[PDB]
């Protein structure tokens, strides 16, 4: 990745946090599915 211009130390943390953000943005949309799922369970009596 960082062969020049940007220092390796920066970009390695950058790769990490990007993989973090992408994962978190996935989890977050999933947790909305669990959210509605429970509400679908609020549906009955």
């Amino acid at each position: 990745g960082p062969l020049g211009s940007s220092v390796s130390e920066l970009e390695q943390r950058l790769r990490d946090v990007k993989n973090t953000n992408s994962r978190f943005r996935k989890a977050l949309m999933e947790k909305e599915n669990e959210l509605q799922a429970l509400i679908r369970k609020l549906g009955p009596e």
């Binding site: 940007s6 950058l14 953000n21 947790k31 669990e34 369970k41």
Partner: protein
Amino acid sequence: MDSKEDEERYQKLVTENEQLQRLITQKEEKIRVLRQRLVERGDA
């Protein structure tokens, strides 16, 4: 040019990291209590 260019990208992404973790927790927290409210009525 320099690391700054990507570091500016970095600092923005860590910033989203903060909020994402916030919401995942808030949703998860809501999910936790939301179950308890339905279960004690739906299943008992």
